[PDB]
PDB file of C-alpha atoms in Angstrom:
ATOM      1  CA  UNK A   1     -11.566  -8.723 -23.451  1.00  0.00           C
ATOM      2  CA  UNK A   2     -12.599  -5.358 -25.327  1.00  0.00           C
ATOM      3  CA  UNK A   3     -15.129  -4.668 -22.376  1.00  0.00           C
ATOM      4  CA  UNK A   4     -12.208  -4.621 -19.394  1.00  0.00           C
ATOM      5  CA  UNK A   5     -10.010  -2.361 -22.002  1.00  0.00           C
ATOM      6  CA  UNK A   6     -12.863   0.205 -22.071  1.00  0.00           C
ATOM      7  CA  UNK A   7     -13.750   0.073 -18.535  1.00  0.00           C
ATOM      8  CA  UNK A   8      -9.752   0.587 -17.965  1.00  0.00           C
ATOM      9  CA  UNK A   9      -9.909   3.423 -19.867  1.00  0.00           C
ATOM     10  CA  UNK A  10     -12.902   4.664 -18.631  1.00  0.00           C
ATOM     11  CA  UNK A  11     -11.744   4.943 -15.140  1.00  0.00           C
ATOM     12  CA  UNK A  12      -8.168   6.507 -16.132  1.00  0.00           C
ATOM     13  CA  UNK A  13     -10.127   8.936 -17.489  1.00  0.00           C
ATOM     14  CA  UNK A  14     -12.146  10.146 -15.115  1.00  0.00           C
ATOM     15  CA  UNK A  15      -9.419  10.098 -12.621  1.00  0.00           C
ATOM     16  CA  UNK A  16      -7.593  13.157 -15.013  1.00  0.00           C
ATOM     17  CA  UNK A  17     -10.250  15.419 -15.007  1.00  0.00           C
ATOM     18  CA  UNK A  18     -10.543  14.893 -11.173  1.00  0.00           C
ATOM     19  CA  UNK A  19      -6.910  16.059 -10.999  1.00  0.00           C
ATOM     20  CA  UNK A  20      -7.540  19.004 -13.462  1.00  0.00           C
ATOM     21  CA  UNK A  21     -10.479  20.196 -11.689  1.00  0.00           C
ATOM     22  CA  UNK A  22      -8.189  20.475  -8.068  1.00  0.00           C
ATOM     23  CA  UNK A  23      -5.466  22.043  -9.675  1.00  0.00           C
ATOM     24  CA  UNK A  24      -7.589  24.983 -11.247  1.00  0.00           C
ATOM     25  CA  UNK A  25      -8.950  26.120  -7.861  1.00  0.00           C
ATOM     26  CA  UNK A  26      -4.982  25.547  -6.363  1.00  0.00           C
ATOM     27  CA  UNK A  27      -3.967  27.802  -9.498  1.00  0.00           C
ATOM     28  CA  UNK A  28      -6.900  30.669  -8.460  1.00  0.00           C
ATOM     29  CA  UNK A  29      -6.090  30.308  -4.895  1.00  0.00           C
ATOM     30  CA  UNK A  30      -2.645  30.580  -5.841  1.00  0.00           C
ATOM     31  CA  UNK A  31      -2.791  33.766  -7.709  1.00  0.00           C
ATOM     32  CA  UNK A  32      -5.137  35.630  -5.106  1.00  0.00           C
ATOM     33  CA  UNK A  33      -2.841  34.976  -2.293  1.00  0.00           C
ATOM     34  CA  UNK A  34       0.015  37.050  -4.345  1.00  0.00           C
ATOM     35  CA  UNK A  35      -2.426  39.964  -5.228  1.00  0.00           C
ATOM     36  CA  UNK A  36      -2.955  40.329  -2.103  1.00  0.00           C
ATOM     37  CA  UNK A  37       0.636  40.136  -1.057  1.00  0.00           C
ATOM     38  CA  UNK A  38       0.674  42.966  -3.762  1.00  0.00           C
ATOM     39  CA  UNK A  39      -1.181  45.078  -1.720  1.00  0.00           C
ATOM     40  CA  UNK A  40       0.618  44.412   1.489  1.00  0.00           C
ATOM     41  CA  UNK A  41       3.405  46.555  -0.832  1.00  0.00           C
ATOM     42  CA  UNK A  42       2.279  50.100  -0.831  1.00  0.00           C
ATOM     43  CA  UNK A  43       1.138  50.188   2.690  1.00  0.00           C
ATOM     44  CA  UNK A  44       3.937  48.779   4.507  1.00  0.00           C
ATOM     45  CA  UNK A  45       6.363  51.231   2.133  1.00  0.00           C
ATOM     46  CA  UNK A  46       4.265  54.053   2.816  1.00  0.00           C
ATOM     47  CA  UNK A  47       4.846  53.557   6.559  1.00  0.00           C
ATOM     48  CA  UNK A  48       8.381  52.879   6.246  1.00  0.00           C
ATOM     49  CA  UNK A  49       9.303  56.279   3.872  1.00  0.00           C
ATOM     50  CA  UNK A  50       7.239  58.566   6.201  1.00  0.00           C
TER      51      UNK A  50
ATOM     52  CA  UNK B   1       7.376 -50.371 -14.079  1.00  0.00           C
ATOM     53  CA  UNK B   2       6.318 -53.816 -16.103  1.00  0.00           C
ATOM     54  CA  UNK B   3       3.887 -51.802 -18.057  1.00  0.00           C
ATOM     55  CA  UNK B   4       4.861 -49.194 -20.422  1.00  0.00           C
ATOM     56  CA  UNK B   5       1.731 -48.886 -22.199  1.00  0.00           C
ATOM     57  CA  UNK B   6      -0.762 -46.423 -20.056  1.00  0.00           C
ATOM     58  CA  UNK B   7       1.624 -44.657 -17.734  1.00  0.00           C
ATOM     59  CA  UNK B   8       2.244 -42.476 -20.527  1.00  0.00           C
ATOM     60  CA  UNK B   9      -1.471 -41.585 -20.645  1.00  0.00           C
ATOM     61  CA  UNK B  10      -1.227 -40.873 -16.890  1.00  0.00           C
ATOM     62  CA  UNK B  11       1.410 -38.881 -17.597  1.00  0.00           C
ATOM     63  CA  UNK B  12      -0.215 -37.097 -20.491  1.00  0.00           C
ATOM     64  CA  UNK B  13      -3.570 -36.523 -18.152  1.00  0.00           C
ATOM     65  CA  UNK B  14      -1.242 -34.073 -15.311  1.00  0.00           C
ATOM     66  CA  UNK B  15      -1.811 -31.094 -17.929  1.00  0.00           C
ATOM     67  CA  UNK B  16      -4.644 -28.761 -18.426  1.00  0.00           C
ATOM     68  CA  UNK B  17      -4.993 -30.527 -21.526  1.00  0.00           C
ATOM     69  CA  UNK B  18      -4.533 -34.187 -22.409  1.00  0.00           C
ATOM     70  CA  UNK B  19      -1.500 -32.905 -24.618  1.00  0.00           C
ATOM     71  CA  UNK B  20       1.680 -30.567 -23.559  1.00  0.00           C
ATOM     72  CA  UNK B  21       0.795 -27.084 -23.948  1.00  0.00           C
ATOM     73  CA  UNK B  22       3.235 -25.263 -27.092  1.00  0.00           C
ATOM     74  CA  UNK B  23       6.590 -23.442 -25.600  1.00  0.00           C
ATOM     75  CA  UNK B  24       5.870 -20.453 -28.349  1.00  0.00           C
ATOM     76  CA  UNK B  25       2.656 -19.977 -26.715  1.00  0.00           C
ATOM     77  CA  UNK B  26       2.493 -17.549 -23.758  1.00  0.00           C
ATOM     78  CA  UNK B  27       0.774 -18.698 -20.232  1.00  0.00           C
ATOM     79  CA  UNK B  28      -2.965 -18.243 -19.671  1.00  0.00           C
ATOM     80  CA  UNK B  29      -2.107 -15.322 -17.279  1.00  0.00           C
ATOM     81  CA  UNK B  30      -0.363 -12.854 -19.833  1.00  0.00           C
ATOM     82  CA  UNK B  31      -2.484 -13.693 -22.806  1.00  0.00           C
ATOM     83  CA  UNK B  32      -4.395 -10.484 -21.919  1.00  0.00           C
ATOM     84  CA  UNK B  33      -7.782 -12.536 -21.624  1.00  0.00           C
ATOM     85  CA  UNK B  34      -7.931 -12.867 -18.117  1.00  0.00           C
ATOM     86  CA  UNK B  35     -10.745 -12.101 -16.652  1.00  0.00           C
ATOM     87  CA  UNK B  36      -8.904 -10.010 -13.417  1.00  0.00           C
ATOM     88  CA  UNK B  37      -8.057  -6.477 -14.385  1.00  0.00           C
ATOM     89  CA  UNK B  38      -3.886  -6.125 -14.181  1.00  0.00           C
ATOM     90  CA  UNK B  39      -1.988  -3.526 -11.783  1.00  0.00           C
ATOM     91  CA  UNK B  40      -1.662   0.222 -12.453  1.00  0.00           C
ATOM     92  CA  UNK B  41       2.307  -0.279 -13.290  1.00  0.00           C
ATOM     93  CA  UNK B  42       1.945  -2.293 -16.029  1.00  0.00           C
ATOM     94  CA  UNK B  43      -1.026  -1.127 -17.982  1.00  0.00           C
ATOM     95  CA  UNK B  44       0.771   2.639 -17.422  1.00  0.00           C
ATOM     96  CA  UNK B  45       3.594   1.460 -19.381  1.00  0.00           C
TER      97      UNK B  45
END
């Protein structure tokens, strides 16, 4: 019985860092889409005031 | 009928065992030594 519980385990585990590792890159990508919304910014107001 | 002597042991032989099994006891499926793992559900909770 002890052998199933660890291979249970085993596997749940494995299946959170798989999670954790796709939502780090879906955090970067996340964050570099809005910096470069950021920059969009000063250009398009630049155009706008002139 | 006309012999009341070994029907009971025919009766006793339609168990796993030659004897009833305990009502305290739980079933051979939720005594957590089957051999199968269990769903995803249950072990979650």
């Amino acid at each position: 019985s002890l052998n199933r519980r660890i291979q249970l385990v085993e596997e749940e585990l494995d299946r959170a860092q798989e999670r954790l590792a796709t939502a780090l890159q879906k955090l970067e990508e996340a964050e570099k889409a809005a910096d470069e919304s950021e920059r969009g910014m000063k250009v398009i107001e630049n155009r706008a005031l002139k | 009928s006309k012999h009341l002597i070994e029907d009971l042991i025919i009766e006793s032989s339609k168990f796993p065992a030659a004897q009833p099994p305990d009502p305290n006891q739980p079933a051979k499926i939720e005594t957590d030594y089957w051999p199968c793992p269990p769903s995803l559900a249950v072990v979650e909770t």
